[PDB]
């Protein structure tokens, strides 16, 4: 269970691929992406968000990876995800794996 994003080299997400999520047979998947992303961009206590940390890392060295982060679906289902991204040749390919 996962989905993919590409970001331009300023950080703006320029597309999302929900293919594998749509192939996965569960409802709720739009809320899920929306929530997972917002979590990904949520500051971390006092440290910057995972999205800010990975974007600075991936631009400096072409790969970055986040720990698990948790987020909550509309019905209060609790999920977690983590993100891996690579700089491709110019854009950032990110994958977001849902540990369920």
């Amino acid at each position: 269970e996962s989905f993919m994003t590409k970001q331009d080299t300023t950080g703006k997400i320029i597309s999302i691929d929900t293919s594998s999520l749509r192939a996965a047979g569960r409802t709720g998947w739009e809320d899920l992406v929306r929530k997972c992303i917002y979590a990904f961009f949520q500051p971390q206590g006092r440290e910057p968000s995972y999205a800010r940390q990975l974007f600075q890392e991936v631009m400096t060295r072409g790969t970055a990876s986040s720990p698990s982060y948790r987020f909550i679906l509309n019905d209060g289902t609790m999920l977690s995800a983590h993100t891996r991204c690579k700089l491709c040749y110019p854009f950032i390919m990110g994958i977001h794996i849902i540990d369920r």
Partner: peptide, 15 residues
Amino acid sequence: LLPPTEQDLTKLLLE
């Protein structure tokens, strides 16, 4: 770095 807004995500998911 700037987070996406709910309208931005609506855009992305329509494409």
